[PDB]
Design an enzyme around this catalytic site. Sequence first.
Site, PDB file in Angstrom:
ATOM      1  N   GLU A 184     -16.920 -49.669  -5.569  1.00 34.27           N
ATOM      2  CA  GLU A 184     -16.993 -49.940  -7.011  1.00 34.27           C
ATOM      3  C   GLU A 184     -18.419 -50.009  -7.581  1.00 34.27           C
ATOM      4  O   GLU A 184     -18.802 -51.016  -8.186  1.00 34.27           O
ATOM      5  CB  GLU A 184     -16.174 -51.190  -7.364  1.00 34.27           C
ATOM      6  CG  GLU A 184     -14.696 -50.953  -7.107  1.00 34.27           C
ATOM      7  CD  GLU A 184     -13.825 -52.193  -7.216  1.00 34.27           C
ATOM      8  OE1 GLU A 184     -12.581 -52.019  -7.173  1.00 34.27           O
ATOM      9  OE2 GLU A 184     -14.356 -53.324  -7.325  1.00 34.27           O
ATOM     10  N   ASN A 321      -9.698 -46.829  -6.327  1.00 35.56           N
ATOM     11  CA  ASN A 321      -9.201 -48.187  -6.492  1.00 35.56           C
ATOM     12  C   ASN A 321      -8.489 -48.263  -7.845  1.00 35.56           C
ATOM     13  O   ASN A 321      -9.114 -48.067  -8.888  1.00 35.56           O
ATOM     14  CB  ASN A 321     -10.350 -49.205  -6.445  1.00 35.56           C
ATOM     15  CG  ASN A 321     -11.068 -49.255  -5.101  1.00 35.56           C
ATOM     16  OD1 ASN A 321     -10.651 -48.648  -4.112  1.00 35.56           O
ATOM     17  ND2 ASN A 321     -12.152 -50.013  -5.058  1.00 35.56           N
ATOM     18  N   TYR A 323      -5.528 -50.409 -10.313  1.00 32.47           N
ATOM     19  CA  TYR A 323      -4.686 -51.563 -10.576  1.00 32.47           C
ATOM     20  C   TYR A 323      -3.933 -51.510 -11.886  1.00 32.47           C
ATOM     21  O   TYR A 323      -2.836 -52.035 -11.981  1.00 32.47           O
ATOM     22  CB  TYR A 323      -5.551 -52.820 -10.644  1.00 32.47           C
ATOM     23  CG  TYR A 323      -6.164 -53.219  -9.348  1.00 32.47           C
ATOM     24  CD1 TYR A 323      -5.551 -54.180  -8.543  1.00 32.47           C
ATOM     25  CD2 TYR A 323      -7.355 -52.657  -8.929  1.00 32.47           C
ATOM     26  CE1 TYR A 323      -6.109 -54.562  -7.340  1.00 32.47           C
ATOM     27  CE2 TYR A 323      -7.924 -53.032  -7.739  1.00 32.47           C
ATOM     28  CZ  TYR A 323      -7.302 -53.986  -6.948  1.00 32.47           C
ATOM     29  OH  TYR A 323      -7.885 -54.356  -5.770  1.00 32.47           O
ATOM     30  N   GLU A 394      -7.369 -49.097  -3.050  1.00 33.70           N
ATOM     31  CA  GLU A 394      -7.068 -50.456  -3.476  1.00 33.70           C
ATOM     32  C   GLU A 394      -5.926 -50.452  -4.464  1.00 33.70           C
ATOM     33  O   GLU A 394      -5.924 -49.652  -5.391  1.00 33.70           O
ATOM     34  CB  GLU A 394      -8.283 -51.121  -4.136  1.00 33.70           C
ATOM     35  CG  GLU A 394      -9.191 -51.843  -3.169  1.00 33.70           C
ATOM     36  CD  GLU A 394     -10.264 -52.691  -3.855  1.00 33.70           C
ATOM     37  OE1 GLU A 394     -10.049 -53.176  -4.996  1.00 33.70           O
ATOM     38  OE2 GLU A 394     -11.323 -52.874  -3.231  1.00 33.70           O
TER      39      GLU A 394
END
Length: 483
Positions: A184, A321, A323, A394
């Site tokens: 990140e 990643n 979410y 992720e």
Amino acid sequence: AAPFTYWLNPEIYDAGGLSRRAFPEGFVFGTAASAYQVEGMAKQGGRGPSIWDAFIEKPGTIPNNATADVTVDEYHRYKEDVNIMKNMGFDAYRFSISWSRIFPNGTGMVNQEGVDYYNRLIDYMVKKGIKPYANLYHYDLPLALHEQYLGWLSPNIVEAFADYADFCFQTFGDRVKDWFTFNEPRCVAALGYDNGFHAPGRCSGCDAGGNSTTEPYLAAHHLILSHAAAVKRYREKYQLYQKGRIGILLDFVWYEPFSDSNADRAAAQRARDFHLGWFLDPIIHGRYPYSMLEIVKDRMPTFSDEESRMVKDSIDYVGINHYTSFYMKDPGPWNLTPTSYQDDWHVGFAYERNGVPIGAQANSYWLYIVPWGINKAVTYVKETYGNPTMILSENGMDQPGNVSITQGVHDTVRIRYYRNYITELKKAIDDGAKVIGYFAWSLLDNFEWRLGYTSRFGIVYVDYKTLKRYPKDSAFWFKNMLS
């Protein structure tokens, strides 16, 4: 734990059609963590201080003035942790190596006790049939390098990181075949240097100093160069003999146009440019995104032709990643005076459409539960960056920290999160996306940076009183799905 802890949740056995046979041959399932968030021994075992060690010192920074000096103590408990991963059916574990645990000063003297730790962890994973995925950097810059030249803000950091990376390759590369330079880097640059929310806490008018108009771009530039320099070492000296791969882990929020208007569509693209393209365009095309170049102008550093060549194609795969997702609106006429990287996007956010929330919220203020967003995000990378090899590196969600063992383990919301997101990921792969792995964040409840222990991301509950592990229903859901 109260007797309700041991109620059998029927959701555990609803895999919603998911199994290994619904995914490509050799598809890897793992969990992901980071050195600072799980290890403990922050001030012990020879470990030099990092920027977060200094950042946490100031009172108020972390809720209840908690630290990661012990956290879930994986430093001593790694065997138990790896045993759980294996019992739950995972193929792999993405962990990170603490730069300052290996080099206390960042350069020069190797801390052998640190090296010995990673050797133990890796040897045990191997013994247990867990594939090691090693990340070199997860927010934990050695404080000495920040003290010497302001860390990521200096070109000096490039060879320093490459030297550290080079060391890790020769030391661990016989067993580690899967490397990441950074986790990140967008967050490193934005959170560390744009609003100072993360270490080193810099921004315009911050107590630590800074300049939100320039420093984020300077940090990001050097992160990209450091990545390319590290990859150059691997490719020239190690890759051929070790037969491993190297990449980078990039966070990607899906930005969905609020309406189908040209303006809203362009706003969503702009947000993707500033969020993902910032790092991916250099790596895939050797140049920064067009919108960034046009908006940020002189405040963005330029690559030399040599640098551009080194950066381009400096990955064997990309980690995404993912979410969450938001709606993105045109904000109307733009402000002319530069204030920050975030302001440079020139976008409006939205969280609902036609009185309907984009999705339910998790514990974390930024995390909306929007399963279709993982499909859009993965498809976007496939269509934009030449169908690269991808790891979904992720994915996960959080409960409040203040939940008891008894209720904490019955995380039906997390089961539905994984079932829905993984199902949408499977759809993207079925449509041609070259995704080779999937990693859940995280095995254990752990230190969640500025949220400290008020956020629980694990598929395994940790009692912070005793450090005892209690697998949540979601862990058993994975165990059933993967078997």
